[PDB]
Paper text:
[name] is a radical S‐adenosyl‐l‐methione (SAM) enzyme that catalyzes the radical‐mediated deamination of TDP‐4‐amino‐4,6‐dideoxy‐d‐glucose (1) to TDP‐3‐keto‐4,6‐dideoxy‐d‐glucose (2) during the biosynthesis of TDP‐desosamine (3). Like other radical SAM enzymes, the catalytic cycle of [name] is characterized by initial single electron transfer from a reduced, active site [Fe4S4]+ cluster to SAM. Each monomeric unit comprises three domains: an N‐terminal domain of six α‐helices, a central radical SAM (RS) domain, and a C‐terminal domain consisting of a β‐hairpin and two α‐helices. The RS domain (residues S132–L369) coordinates the single [Fe4S4] cluster via residues C141, C145, and C148, which make up the CX3CX2C motif.
Addition of TDP‐4‐amino‐4,6‐dideoxy‐d‐glucose or TDP‐d‐quinovose during crystallization screening did not result in the acquisition of a ternary complex structure in either case, and an effort was made to remove the C‐terminal His6‐tag found to occupy the binding pockets of chains a and c. Therefore, a second [name] expression construct was generated by inserting the [name] gene into the pSJ5 expression vector containing a TrxA fusion partner, His8‐tag, and TEV site. This produced soluble, high‐purity protein without the N‐terminal His‐tag after purification by Ni‐NTA extraction and TEV enzyme digestion. The corresponding crystals were grown in 0.1 m MES monohydrate containing 20% PEG 6000 and 1.0 m LiCl at pH 6.0. The asymmetric unit consisted of two [name] monomers, neither bound SAM; instead, the fourth iron of the [Fe4S4] cluster in one monomer coordinated with a water molecule and the other with methionine. Comparison with the binary [name]·SAM structure (rmsd 0.533 Å) revealed that the flexible loop between residues D323 and E337, which interact with the adenine moiety of SAM in the binary structure, was also missing from the density map. Addition of 1 or 4 to the crystallization media did not result in substrate‐bound complexes.
Numbering used by the authors: 10 to 323, 338 to 485
The structure:
Amino acid sequence: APAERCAHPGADLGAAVHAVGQTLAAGGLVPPDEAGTTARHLVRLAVRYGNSPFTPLEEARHDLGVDRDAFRRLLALFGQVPELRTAVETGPAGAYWKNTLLPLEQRGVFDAALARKPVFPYSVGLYPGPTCMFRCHFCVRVTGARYDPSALDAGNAMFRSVIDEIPAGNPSAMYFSGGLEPLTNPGLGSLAAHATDHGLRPTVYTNSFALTERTLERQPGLWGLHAIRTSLYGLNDEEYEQTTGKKAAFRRVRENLRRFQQLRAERESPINLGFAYIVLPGRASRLLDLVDFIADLNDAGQGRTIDFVNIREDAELQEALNAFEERVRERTPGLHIDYGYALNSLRTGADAELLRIKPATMRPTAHPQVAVQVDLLGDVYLYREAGFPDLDGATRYIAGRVTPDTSLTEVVRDFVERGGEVAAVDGDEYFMDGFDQVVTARLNQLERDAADGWEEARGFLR
Ligand code: SF4
């Protein structure tokens, strides 16, 4: 429907305006003589927030050129045109709205962060790996940097205690990922077993280099995971060496996943399999080779197919994305595609840059109500990419340490209740992952809207 699609490049706004005007007039919401003018303002707001989801309400108001009073009425009328919310939620910016902003809002998570309440974190990352075998360009691993082997026993006992804390109501709250490589922890399978015994359904994010048949034999609890998402660093040995520094690494990862596919089919295991792939500038044609890679694994699986792929950026991208989507429908129809925030709007030809938070726009309280990460030492990191040993300036972002005497619940509560705040210095912004930046940008928007006297309407859509 025209009003449902109006945020995409080249959309028919005349048809969107007519459709919205008809809804307003048929609902008695505005006099028919003025329905067209108001419908144009509402379509403009849908186009705006369907492309730029963090826009302060006052900036959008100024761009419409209307009264604070007229804007209040517009926001109320917007809520009575369901097609326009669809236009925002499925627009170029739709990955922001449907995958992150609106699920967290509806779970009260941004409300808790905004009010700075000492709630248990919504998403808890456990970083259980003491090392990694790869040597990616800018990671601490291109030093000796690693956790001491002696930390494993106490660390794994600490992780179990954190698993015992996870409140009910969200089986996916906890995941295993890292700074460093989780499969490097000999006890990861028993942590996964512990988690599944406590009703959790966690995913592991891994390079899968050590996901061999021998590892599964020593760590049978990995089979009980909800999912294994392999970070794909290339599609042949050459591209893998460029990225990881390791030779023959693609064939090892592919060899591991081929065998894993056959074992998953033999055990009839409910575990899911996904991949994360980064499209490099000018190399978007490689997405077709990613389909070939996945189809091959599907052949190893005797019917059991790869479940999902996550594709993000950082020759014409929109064409390569289109060709990629066609190739998936052709060769791997059951494959679910999840697009990162930028590539999701590039799908329809919309100009899109990823967020680039700088120290001036970092929130000194961070957002532990939304996410924290815990490493082998029990240190609770406030941003996903600060949790690396020997990483310069990163320990400033430790909210506290989980020990036998202090729980994760207590670390977070104590840090929130004392008004804990970390002043941002240059470079701290690289401790944030894409999720941290979306959460920061959303909370900056919510704080701005509330400060401008739009408390209930804060964030435009919720
Ligand atoms: S970025 Fe990840 S895979 Fe690469 S060296 Fe660091 S921990 Fe290992």
